[PDB]
Ligand binder design. Structure first.
Ligand SMILES: *Cc1ccc(-n2c(-c3ccc(OCCO)cc3)nc3ccccc32)cc1Br
Ligand SMILES: *Cc1ccc(-n2c(-c3ccc(OCCO)cc3)nc3ccccc32)cc1Br
Lengths: 230, 7, 230, 7
């Protein structure tokens, strides 16, 4: 709504300025405005959208975990629960906003593997964040929504992208985290990380120096998780 | 556990 | 307004939770609500108010400096200026909010030296932040408002507080920064820091170990600035 | 120049 009067190019320009200023709420609002212009996003623009919202929700999640820990230790008056609930509702609202952008209409217009995988990974991630705070009748459905998004992304990535593609790698990293932290499936998490790492290692020989650097950065995160989990 | 970081 | 229905004690409790969660915007809103209950603030509460707003405006100022630097290098379309202006207006609004709390009615009800000095120091600081971004007809008046607040605080502190009092020290630190960065008076800045440091050093013998630690922490900041400035 | 920090 509020960004409706600003040029798409100006919104993208201001998102980049907001990133430099570490103003991630502004960054996200600018990128939401850009998405709502109705055009497909380029690779760079997709990454600006992702950075903005991941920083916003990352702060919310960190706050939620602090407050949830205090609340758990408490089990005084209603204030800890109320404030945890306030942060939770704000986080849920941001996740619903991102999911709404993906559904209206980024995913449906995304035909190339790179864009479709990127958006489905995001869909998995934001349902995952919803799952982290879920306790009601729809919690299993939230978890399944994350799983379904990640699984569609995985199926396309395996068919259409090399094993070293950074999006394919990051998707596998995050789906492995889903398995370990949300689905109570540590063995699946470990298997996925290990297979991803090994298949990427075997394809590094095909890469330029710059691509190598990108792929190996994410492989190291896989390895770091495998080290933590084993 | 760590997921993919932001830059 | 929005915190009008919450108990004062609950607002203070939630400000502390917000601090632990690094949710400083929430912290500031909670403390604004507490101030608006109309009662005087205790020492601890005064410090919660200060921490909350200093974190909020500190982020805004950092963003403003990033954007102002980009704008200066640019001198492309209006977007850098517009977004710098947007951050500036938000910063001005936060400063006006704090100044409004001080004027309605924290300062007038503050009779003890410790509270009155604390609030007048805050008044100087927030006019100082207004001065950092000021360019219009009232810029000299903004600078003088900062100066006047700091000077009243200094006069009370010198009469009523020992030279090692942390508020007296922090006031001198910030007034010295005012002189160096805003009033184009580096010699006054250096004199103030030096005299403050030396008079505090001579009074350290009177302190407990815990008071000593507090006073010396701020003395070291004075010394750090003197080292930078000379 | 640095002013008084926040905790
Ligand atoms: C989910 C996702 C995966 C990959 C990329 N991405 C990267 C890239 C991201 C992070 C990296 O390491 C992090 C730890 O050091 C390494 C590479 N490079 C890309 C190029 C093109 C498109 C996407 C890319 C982004 C994201 Br959001
Ligand atoms: C403006 C102001 C001055 C002093 C205090 N303050 C302190 C205190 C603040 C910061 C310190 O060091 C910072 C660098 O390490 C050391 C001490 N201690 C206090 C006790 C009681 C009242 C105020 C106090 C706060 C502020 Br906002």
């Amino acid at each position: 709504g509020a960004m409706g009067s600003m040029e798409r190019a100006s919104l993208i320009q201001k998102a980049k300025l907001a990133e430099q200023a570490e103003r991630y709420e502004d960054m996200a609002a600018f990128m939401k405005g850009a998405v709502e212009k109705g055009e497909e996003l380029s690779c760079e623009e997709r990454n600006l959208l992702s950075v903005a919202y991941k920083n916003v929700v990352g702060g919310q999640r960190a706050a939620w975990r602090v407050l949830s820990s205090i609340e758990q230790k408490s089990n005084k008056g209603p204030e800890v629960r109320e404030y945890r609930e306030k942060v939770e509702t704000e986080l849920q609202g941001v996740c619903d906003t991102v999911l709404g952008l993906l559904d209206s209409h980024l995913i449906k217009e995304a035909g190339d593997a790179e864009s479709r995988v990127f958006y489905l990974k995001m869909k998995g991630d934001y349902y995952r964040y919803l799952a982290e705070v879920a306790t009601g009748d729809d919690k299993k459905r939230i978890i399944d929504s994350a799983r379904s998004a990640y699984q569609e992304a995985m199926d396309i990535s395996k068919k259409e992208m090399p094993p070293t593609n950074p999006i394919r790698l990051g998707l596998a990293l995050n789906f492995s985290v889903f398995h370990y932290e949300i689905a109570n499936s540590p063995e699946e998490a470990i298997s996925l990380a290990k297979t991803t790492f090994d298949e990427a290692m075997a394809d590094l020989h095909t890469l330029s120096e710059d691509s190598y650097k990108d792929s190996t950065l994410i492989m190291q995160l896989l390895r770091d998780n495998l080290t933590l989990w084993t | 556990t760590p997921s993919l970081p932001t830059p």
